[PDB]
Amino acid sequence: GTDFGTTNNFVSPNLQLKQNVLPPTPKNIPLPAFGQRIIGWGTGAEGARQRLENIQPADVSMIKKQGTTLEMITAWQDFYEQEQQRNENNPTAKYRARLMKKIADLW
């Protein structure tokens, strides 16, 4: 496959000026394995609906065990919450972000 990132670079909350890039991911899996098999969120808006509106206290606790932190449930949230502004027509990001919010509420 071959990929890389910046898993040791952090800043203060003041980055209102970047280009189009995804947030980082844990050194266990890529994006198409950070959610489907983890967050139960399928891949197509509805997946994330099915595990958002009715989440459980277990569905949070598990994600840590797979190599994740509260740090991983802040930037994917705010990223998906950011794209809602530009394109309101995006239910996929809408449910994904909202899923993160609930997971962080149970942390």
Widest pairwise Cα distance in the chain: 37
Q: What CA–CA distance (Å, rounded) separates 43 from 79?
A: 16
Q: How far is CA 12 from CA 9, 74, 75, 81, 89, in A?
A: 11, 14, 13, 19, 31
Give the count of beta carbons closer than 10 Å to the beta carbon of residue 29: 16
Which CATH number, 3.90.1150.10, 1.10.10.10, 3.90.550.10, 4.10.640.20, labels domain 1-107?
Answer: 4.10.640.20
Residue 98: Cβ-neighbour burial (10 angstroms; 0-12, 13-18, 19+) = middle
For the chain, after which residues does the C atom lie more than 2.5 Å from the next written residue's N, i.e. where is it broken? none
* Contacts of residue 29, Cβ cutoff 8 Å, sequence gap at least 6: 38, 66, 67
